[PDB]
Amino acid sequence: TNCDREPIHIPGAIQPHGVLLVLSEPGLVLTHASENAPAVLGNSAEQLLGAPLGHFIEPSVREPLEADLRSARLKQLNPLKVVWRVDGVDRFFDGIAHRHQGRLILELEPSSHREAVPFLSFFHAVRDGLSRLRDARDLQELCEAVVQEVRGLTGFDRAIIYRFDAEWNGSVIAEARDARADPYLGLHFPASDIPRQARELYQLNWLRIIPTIDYQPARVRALPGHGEPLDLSFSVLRSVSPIHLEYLHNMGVQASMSISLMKDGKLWGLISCTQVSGTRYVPYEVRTACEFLGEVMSSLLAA
Amino acid sequence: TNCDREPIHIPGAIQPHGVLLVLSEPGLVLTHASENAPAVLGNSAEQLLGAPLGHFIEPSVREPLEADLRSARLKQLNPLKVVWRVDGVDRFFDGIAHRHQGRLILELEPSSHREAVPFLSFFHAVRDGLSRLRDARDLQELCEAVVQEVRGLTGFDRAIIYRFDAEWNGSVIAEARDARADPYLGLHFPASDIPRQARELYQLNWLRIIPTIDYQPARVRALPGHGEPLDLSFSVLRSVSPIHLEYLHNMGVQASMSISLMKDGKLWGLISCTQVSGTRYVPYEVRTACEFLGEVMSSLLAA
Ligand SMILES: */C=C\C1=C(C)C(=O)N/C1=C\c1[nH]c(Cc2[nH]c(/C=C3\NC(=O)C(C=C)=C3C)c(C)c2CCC(=O)O)c(CCC(=O)O)c1C
Ligand SMILES: */C=C\C1=C(C)C(=O)N/C1=C\c1[nH]c(Cc2[nH]c(/C=C3\NC(=O)C(C=C)=C3C)c(C)c2CCC(=O)O)c(CCC(=O)O)c1C
């Protein structure tokens, strides 16, 4: 059987800090809703399933949101501004929507604290980060620049560059760390620690975040006739493989984030961040800044 | 005498769509002010020279603005939010401040129309642009991607990649254009069209914009004992060489913007945009998005 066979893209559940909805097209009827929607949204699955999205959206946000969800050209439009009028009292969310395997999936994460101008942090993060990455004169300086930059933006206890060999064993070739985190720099690990179906998924979906490894997976409920396993390959809230969560627990890690490094269309390595402390709910603008720096580093893996 | 000798970094004047101030440190006393300040700011040079900056700033913006100007770490903090309370009635500006040759220069450009969330356009421009640049498989596709991207963001009639040879002659190696603009693709030009002191300045200051070639230069006035030619090398409002403005007039160009392409610390080429139509007051977020794409392209000039 071994490591490579557990699926991972169809867990049937999400990480409960956000809500996952599936929307029909073109009508935007909710055909799936994750069952943590009462805690996060103020509505039940029963109120949600089969209702049109617009019924729950503050009316002045509604028309542009529906226009974006139908756009196809959908991020490029992410993040979507979603304002949920429940009882009502608005709740504010960043929507990340995508199409995959014929379904339109909308993920909702509570909008960040502040007031502190939208997208200003991303502007500074990628400008300052790009010039630090360009200062690097070789691969090893590039790696150290990225890991210092990502740890600064996220606050993670540890950030490494994890590089794959021929073979798919990995090596910790650069590390930035708080002093509370043991040093993994220089360690090599077998290929099965990131098994083959994970590596294949990470060639397509370049960012994953587990802000706490202790969560109760929120099942995705569906209208009768619907689900059938939801392919969650491109969903940021996808519940991750339980055996990886026990790897993290045994390693003493409470939260994780990694970013794929690509070279010639093939997975080259990861930027891997870990928290030994407590949780790490990285905000949207920070995650996206980090993933953007991973793309820059990936494009600089040349000569 | 010839082309290489006219200075260009000390014209004594600026392009009048913004205001240039020089500030003492640490006290932020205005020692220089451009003479278009009545039109743009609502104050005269006489009211400005020798007054502390804070006297003109809306009080809730004032402390953070002064903190930034003293920071050193100054962009990284650009753009500064500057709210000018004159009579009073607030006016809103993006401040771009820099230190050079011992002076602290603050340039003020009216804040953009809207309402349309700050920095959202930059977020989308650099994300969408980076992935189009990464799609390029060789230098020629890179060049065509950049020129299509920059023309899309700015609306310029023409955008070219202008590459320097051994020698500093130039070649138009890629072009995107409205059909109203004659094609320069494939043309070669002598080194003197971008003379040596311009090329040296452009190795240090990677962006220049002339939103209309028909402007009355606004003299920079100074307190007695002060100016002495203000070195405007890193100032975005620097009035450009009059002979270049007549080159543009004869070429039939009403507005221009170029971005330096760097390779191994040496000027490699320019992204050059021209308007045959009318003016081109490119907004701050667009200019910065374009310059960021120029840095990415510069970093990809490798192998
Ligand atoms: C055969 C089953 C598995 C064994 C044994 C094992 O050790 N992992 C197994 C399955 C598995 N791993 C992952 C994802 C994963 N694994 C890592 C490994 C590391 N994290 C570190 O900090 C270090 C060394 C310092 C290593 C090595 C990483 C980075 C990841 C990516 C996720 C993350 O960033 O935390 C999966 C997929 C989990 C999922 O995507 O659902 C599986 C099934
Ligand atoms: C000896 C004096 C000069 C002669 C003769 C001439 O032709 N230019 C001279 C001086 C000069 N040029 C510049 C800056 C400059 N020149 C160009 C040239 C081109 N623009 C085009 O569209 C093309 C071809 C399609 C060419 C060739 C460019 C792009 C620039 C940069 C400024 C801009 O983007 O418009 C200067 C410096 C002007 C300044 O920075 O003050 C000078 C003195």
Residue numbers in the entry:
A (entry chain A), B (entry chain A): 16 to 318
Reproduce, without paraphrasing, sentences from the article in which this PDB structure was first reported.
Phytochromes are red-light photoreceptors found in various plants and microorganisms. S. aurantiaca contains two previously uncharacterized bacteriophytochromes (BphPs) denoted SaBphP1 and SaBphP2, which may be responsible for the light-stimulated growth of multicellular fruiting bodies. The classical BphPs switch between a red absorbing state denoted Pr (λmax ≃ 700 nm) and a far-red absorbing state denoted Pfr (λmax ≃ 750 nm).
The SaBphP1 and other myxobacterial BphPs lack a conserved histidine (His) at position 289 in the GAF domain. In the classical BphPs, the equivalent His forms a critical hydrogen bond to the BV ring D that stabilizes the Pr state. SaBphP1 contains a threonine (Thr289) at this position, which is replaced by glycine in some myxobacterial BphPs. The wild-type and mutant CBDs both crystallize in the dark in the Pr state in space group P3221. However, the T289H mutation hardly changes the overall structure of the CBD dimer as the root-mean-square deviation (r.m.s.d.) between wild-type and mutant is on the order of 0.3 Å. Since the CBDs do not form stable Pfr spectra, but the PCMs do, the PHY domain is essential for the mechanics of the photoswitch.
